[PDB]
Structure formats: C-alpha cells, structure tokens
Design a protein around this nucleic acid. Structure first.
Lengths: 377, 377, 48, 97
RNA sequence: CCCCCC
RNA sequence: CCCCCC
RNA sequence: CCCCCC
RNA sequence: CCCCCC
RNA sequence: CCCCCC
C-alpha cells in the first residue's frame, strides 16, 4: 500500500526537531556585565520627570560607552510601571546579563544632575552637538500638572519601537519610511503632534540596536508580556502593541509571501514534476512555524532557525515561481529589488506569463456558485 | 499470500544492524597522550585576553609539534565558559585522549610570556613569518573595557568552524568559498567586519583538522551539547550553531539529493524493472539514517557507516538516474564535476531526456485541485 | 550493471538455454512496461 | 546487594555520617568497587538532573563508560512524554514541553 | 589446588 | 581511598 | 568449491 | 571514500 | 543572511 510514499513521508523528520532536554551547566555564557540601569523612586510626576532630561541627553551625546548607553536605553524604555525594579528582574529572563538596581531619590541639592542614593554623578550624567527636538527653544522638560506626562513619555517610546522594525532587516539609511509613521498617530489623537526628534538622535539609537544582541532580547520579551496581559491594558501599552503589529515576521519574505502568492492562489501551472519536490518539503517547514508559536513571528531577530530552514535555498524553484506569479497581483513589488544567487529567472518569467495570458477566462473551477461563460473583461 | 514478497521483505535485515552490547575491556585503544590544554583562571577580561595573543601566535608559527598545536586549538576554541576545566572533562567523552588541566594565573612578572602555576615557559609560548591579520600594524591584543571582548573572541572562532565544513570533504585549496562566508555576517552586524586572518594561518589549521581524528571528535561533540541547550542560549553560542547549520551531511551527496531529485519528483519513467531492485533497498537504508538520529548528520567525519551503506555503489542505477534527471531542475550542477567507476552514462542521459521532452504538458495527475488543459508554456 | 566482465563464468551446470532467455527479456522490453505500480505512475508516454 | 549495604548505614546510626574520617567501613563496603555497574549508571543518568556536576572530575579504574553514556541517553531521549505512570492523580496526554 | 577487580 | 552542591 | 563492483 | 548550492 | 506593503 504505497510503501515508498509512506516511508518518504517519514523522511521529513530530518527537519524537525532538535531535542529539548536538561543539558544546562556545561554550555553557559558566563562573564556577566553590570549595566547600570537608572530606576526612579516612588510613583509620582517628580524626579523621573527631570530624569527624562538626563537620559535623553546622555543618549544623544558623543563620547559615551556601551553599558552607559545600553542602561539608559533600558531605563528610558521602562518608565511606566509602579515598580520597574521588580518588573525588570521578572521579565529579563536572560542568563548572560544581570541587571543591577539604582534607586533615584528626590533632587534635594543637585550640584550638576542627581545624587541617586554619596553623590556619584561626576561623569555619568554630567558629561551644541547632541542634538535636540526640531524646535531650538524647548526647555525645562515639562514640569507641570500630572496630566500630559503620559503623552510626553509615550512620544519618545513610540519612535523607539518603530526603529526595531528597521534594524535587523537592513540599514536603509538612504531612504526609510520613518516619516510615514510620524504622520500616522496624528490624524487620530493618539499622541500630541509635537516633540519630533531629529534623525541624528535616531541614528545613534538605531545603530546600537542592530549592534547589541541582548538589547533586542529585552525589547522582544517586553512585547510578549504586555500582549498577553488580559483585561483593559494600560493606555501606553495599547500604543506599544500598536507599533508591535508591524514586526510580524519582518524578514521572512520568502515564507509568508510564497504561500499567499504561490499556494493560496492555485494556478493551473502549479502541480508539476518540477514543483512536486519543493511542495512536499514546504509543508513540513510550515508546521515548524506553528508548532512552536508564541515567539514564532520573532525569529529573524534572535532565533537561529532562519539560517537554513526558512531560507529559500531549500526551495529555490517554488520560491522563484511564487514570487514571479505574484507581481501583477499586488502593486507593491518595487521596493524589493530582488537578486540572489539562486534567482532562477527561467521559472520566474513563467509565473508572470501565466497571469498575463489568462486575463480571466478561467475561474478556479468553483463547482458551487459561479455560473457559466460571460467573462469578457 | 505472497510468501515470496513477505520473505523478501525480511531479507533486508542484512543491512541493519550490528549488535550493541557490553563488549568493552577487550577492544581498547590504550596509549593515552597528554595534550597540554591551557585554561584561564577566574572569570574576567584579564590573563585570558593576553593569553589569546600567545595561542594565536603559537598556532601561526613554524617549528611546532602535534600536541602543542592540538592543545592550543582546543584551548583557543573553549574560551567562553565560566569553568572550562569542568566543561572539558564532562564534554570530552573520548577514551583515547585524557585532557590535563593547566591553570593560568595573573601575569605578575612575565619574563617572556606567562608562568601559569615554577615558570615553565622556556619554549612553550616563547618560541616576520607567522603571520598576522591583514593589517600590518595591529597590536596589544585589545586591552580595554569588558565590552568588545565578546566580538574579538567570536571573530576567531567563527572562522574555525567554517573550515570544518571544508576539511574532510576535499582539500579544495585551488578555489574555496571562504570569502563568501566572510562577506556574510557583515551585512548584518553579527561580528565586527575587521580582524581578518590571512589564508596562511587558515592553511596550517585546516591541514591539522583533516590530519588528526580526535581533534574533530571534540569539535563535533561540542556542537551536540550547545545545540540541545534549552532556553536563551549565549550570544556566542548562537554564532556557533549558525555556522554548524552548514555541516548538514557535508559529504552524503548520493543520499540527500537522490531522494530530492529522484523520489520526491516522481517522474513517469521511475518505477521500472531496472529501478525496482534499487528502490526497495534504498528505503531500508533511509531508515538507518533516522533510527539513530542525534549524530546522523555527522557521519562522514568520524562514523564508519559511510563506507558501504550510504555509498552509491549499492545502487548505481537509481543514483545515476536521480542525478541525471535533476540537472535542469537546479542550476547548481557545475561545481560537482562527477566521474565515478560506476557512473552509468546510459541511464544518466535518460533522466535528462525526460525533463526536456516533457516541458510541462503532464502535471503529476494531481486529482484534487488542478484543472484541465491550458498549459502552453 | 556494467560490472560483469571480471567474473568469467563457466560451470558444469551453466545452463545456457535459460541464460540467453534472461538477456532476451531486458533487450526486448526497453521500457514500455513499468512493473504495473498501481499507486503513482501514470499512463503512456514512455518513448525512450 | 546494594540494599543490604544500605541497612549497614542505618542499623548503627549515631556515628553513621562520620565514617570516612575514622571508621574503616569505607574501605570496601561503601566503595563503588562492589557495584561498578549500578554506580556508573546512577552517576551518568544524574548529570542533566543537577547542574552541579563539574567539580567532580570523575575517573576511576572501573568507570565503565559503556553504561555511563546509557544513563545520559535516557534523560535526553525521553524529554518528558512518560510520567512515571502515577496511577492516582496525573491525567492523560498534553505534555508538549 | 591457585591465577582478576576492589 | 577521595575529588561537587547545600 | 571460488572467480566482479563497492 | 569525497568533489555543489544554502 | 536581509532588502516591499500594511
């Protein structure tokens, strides 16, 4: 009873899956860094308000070290919790990095910054090319009634999560759709259309995100926690998840599209001897994505599964057809410049040839509710 | 009820499997070598930092012995663990070789190297043709803040694991795709695009890898441990596994391809009296690969199963067809120059004849969702 | 298999009557038949 | 034979933890020489259980590496699935991790 | 009669 | 004979 | 009794 | 025995 | 390895 096919179906075990077992102790990172993360004191619109000025200054400033910028980026991000110190320890889930806790107290004296209980602020905050917002005049980092603090805090964070989308994908320094995001969240009053930061400030941040690995781990883990939060999530948390809805497999172009354009469309020239081999192995790969879940969209950023599994190197024939056939379908096929060693232009033009020759006529059979003839256009 | 076929199916037991039993004591290697492996002291960015300079000098230097180079290659590899001494003893799993532990202490005096507690460094480290990195100027082996040590350490290791792919397969000294790997891991900031080592340094290392057997055993065993490590693995460990994703049966060309091109495609001219005998015995061989697992991709390097089982000598007819039919499928059929005593060119051209005569027309039956006619191209 | 030159053959019970019969089958067929295979084969289209 | 040895430890008591320091009972009785097969398996199977298996460098004349790897092979192949039967309060299926 | 390992 | 962790 | 190829 | 592409 | 649109 088809012994060849039954055994062939079993051969797909080569893909899934490496074993998960308690093999700890041996393979460990070790060498733990410190990373001083400033954390505010009590829950109020003081101290942390003026601390915002010190962190944003520290980030946007030449002559800075790694941990000093890393800790500031973590501190400036986590600034909407009653107890950030407790939040970080619970959410970090990272063996390589141990986060220290530095409590910030009320600014009683302030020689040239803060004291954060021993005024150890000789060259941490107390370090014009920096720079600043678009307006060369803003000052005092908004010291006013508690209303408004939520907007001015969310303004900075909103821009940070956008850079995550365009960091590990490509540098894209020449031309990026950053302004396209800023004009959004303005037509609708989600954040006050003001406090725009210059590209220079965004540049030094975007560079460090792509550089450090652990910095991205903290950001990704932050999303998984706030997304699964049931009930009415905080106002800020809604804005965070809103930006995170764009990261959906930001990198797996030869996986999420090859199914939509290649498999979901079902053209007559699909099930051939050429594509028979690639079609079968593609299904086993698709199972890998779903069987894990949770962190499945976040693969290209940290996970190593995108090296050989999700790559189009395993199925260059089917990928070339699915990409070629889906050119006339969606207009958005200009930015992706294409060009790989296994581009396979022979079958690429074949896909484009199908959509132009058909021009309707056929209607995917559809033996239920379609009708007969009468399809001029 | 087909007594011939039922008994014939039982005849495949000749392949699988030699017995696994406690037959130790008699067949043993004995004659244990020493191999002095330098191991750093406490967990810090000192001693081991300058030790890196002494090992890389020792490796890239004429007038050196086997164990001196072997131990250095082991030491330079295992340099990202809190307790390498404990790691090695647990992970070695090798009876023939017993690894000694040499603790390295703080460089307090340093006459011409290190003392590693008795300054026994007369001609171990204290031995211009060597050589060095591309830049004829680099020095001081980077003595700076702890940040950066992870990159400069990972730079050397990243190149070592690449050479493993091209060591037991073939020498390939005339032209190898080493530069193709170095341009990768650069477009994306995984390692700093710098500290490139000359081919001469890579030559003496690649030669020793192919020469010694036990040296490869330690490297292979290292991968199986770090791959099965659950949770968020170290940053370096991700880079190690990334390179290990290319070793996937680096040698079994007549096994992983003959299924993809021959069996997975299913052409009309497949199930013949000629290929009937080779098709049956191939399935029993395929089971051997999966039934063991774990170290199944790593067969050609150490395991002796690749002598007669996975070789195409058992099935030269089916192999010649599967290879011949899969020429027009994938463009990458130029590097493999072919040419064996049992090449069988009669059936080789037959496979190529099928793909050129068909040119579509047939569509693998596919009695589900295909349609009828309309396949000009 | 091409490797049938070294083995020189030649026994008292060689039986050349049925020996040529086996060789006659592989040369007369030249494809055409495909071991039935009632699962995944198809119909016709076997010129070579 | 291991059970009879275990009784020796309890039947005396009082100075039972203090054996290796003065008492001569640790020469042949408590040594693994009497049971090198079971000891090699118990030590090998309990490597992935507790992380603290680095300091003890191992290495004896009767190490028996054949059965040592067998113990380590069991814990890595299982990866859950089985649940020690436990015919009281366990349930059925649903053990992905 | 006895040939090890502990 | 003994090499850990608590 | 045995003559190959791997 | 092994020669590619990922 | 990655290049879009949302």
């Amino acid at each position: 009873m088809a012994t060849l096919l039954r055994s062939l179906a079993l051969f797909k075990r080569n893909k899934d899956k490496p074993p998960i077992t308690s093999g700890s102790g041996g393979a460990i990172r070790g060498i733990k860094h410190i990373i001083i993360v400033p954390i505010p004191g009590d829950s109020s619109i003081t101290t942390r308000s003026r601390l915002l000025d010190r962190l944003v200054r520290l980030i946007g400033n030449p002559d800075v070290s790694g941990p000093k910028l890393t800790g500031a980026l973590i501190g400036i991000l986590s600034l909407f919790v009653e107890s950030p110190g407790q939040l970080i320890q619970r959410i970090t889930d990272d063996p390589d990095v141990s986060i220290r806790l530095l409590e910030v107290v009320q600014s009683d004296q302030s020689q040239s910054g803060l004291t954060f209980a021993e005024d150890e602020a000789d060259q941490y905050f107390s370090h014009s090319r920096f720079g600043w917002f678009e307006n060369k005049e803003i000052s005092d980092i908004e010291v006013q009634d508690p209303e408004g603090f939520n907007m001015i805090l969310g303004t900075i964070l909103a821009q940070i999560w956008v850079l995550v989308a365009k960091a590990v994908t490509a540098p894209d320094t020449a031309a990026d759709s950053e302004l396209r995001r800023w004009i959004k969240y303005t037509q609708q009053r989600r954040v006050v259309g003001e406090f725009r930061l210059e590209r220079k400030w965004l540049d030094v941040v975007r560079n460090r995100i792509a550089e450090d690995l652990s910095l991205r781990r903290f950001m990704v883990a932050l999303i998984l926690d706030i997304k699964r939060t049931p009930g009415n999530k905080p106002r800020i948390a809604e804005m965070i998840c809103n930006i995170d809805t764009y990261i959906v497999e930001a990198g797996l172009a030869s996986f999420i599209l090859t199914i939509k354009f290649g498999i979901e469309t079902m053209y007559p020239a699909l099930g051939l001897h050429e594509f028979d081999g690639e079609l079968s192995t593609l299904e086993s790969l698709m199972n890998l994505y779903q069987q894990m879940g949770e962190t499945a969209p976040y693969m290209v950023i940290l996970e190593n599964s995108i090296q050989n599994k999700f790559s189009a190197g395993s199925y260059p024939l089917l990928w070339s057809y699915a990409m070629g056939v889906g050119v006339e379908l969606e207009n958005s096929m200009g930015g992706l410049n294409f060009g790989r060693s296994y581009f396979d232009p022979a079958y690429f033009r074949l896909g484009q040839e199908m959509v132009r020759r058909s021009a309707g006529k056929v209607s995917s059979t559809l033996a239920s509710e379609l009708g007969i003839t009468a399809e001029d256009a």
